């Protein structure tokens, strides 16, 4: 007789954003799904498992939301710190319990662990055949 029924585990929801770990000896890329809630720490159950010997299990939580308006999809990220070890976002200490994170945002967990967040959308393109024309305020040089 078997000893397994139904589905308990749950992962690989839907691609949306990623986390890049800035290290002077390497780099680490993490995948962020539309789980509404993301866990960061040492707990394997958490969303993102850092490589720190003293990384808080509940270190921090990230809210991944995806909504469609007009035609495209607008995603927003929220940072929540339980307050215990030490989490720094945007190079500054967090005080509020409802920080809004967007594309191109540097995040630091603990003190040394530093990573940048950016939306993955689906599949980026190269800058070899992608010219940037001035009209919708894209650049200024």
């Amino acid at each position: 007789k078997r000893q397994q029924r139904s589905n308990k585990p749950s992962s690989e929801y839907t691609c949306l954003g990623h986390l890049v770990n800035l290290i002077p000896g390497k780099e680490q890329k993490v995948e962020i799904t539309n789980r509404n809630v993301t866990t960061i720490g040492r707990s394997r159950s958490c969303d993102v498992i850092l490589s720190e010997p003293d990384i808080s299990t509940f270190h921090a939580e990230f809210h991944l939301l995806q909504m469609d308006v007009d035609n495209f999809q607008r995603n927003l990220i929220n940072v929540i710190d339980k307050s215990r070890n030490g989490t720094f976002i945007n190079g500054n200490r967090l005080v509020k319990k409802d920080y809004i994170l967007k594309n191109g945002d540097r995040i630091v967990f603990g003190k040394s662990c530093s990573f940048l967040f950016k939306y993955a959308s689906s599949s980026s393109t190269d800058i070899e055949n992608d010219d940037e024309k001035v009209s919708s305020e894209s650049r200024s040089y």
């Binding site: 720490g41 040492r42 707990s43 394997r44 159950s45 010997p53 003293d54 808080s56 299990t57 509940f58 270190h59 215990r84 070890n85 030490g86 603990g110 003190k111």
Partner: peptide, 10 residues
């Protein structure tokens, strides 16, 4: 998967 809880830092 059993991981060590939170700890103190320097």
């Amino acid at each position: 998967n059993i991981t060590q809880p939170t700890q103190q830092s320097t």
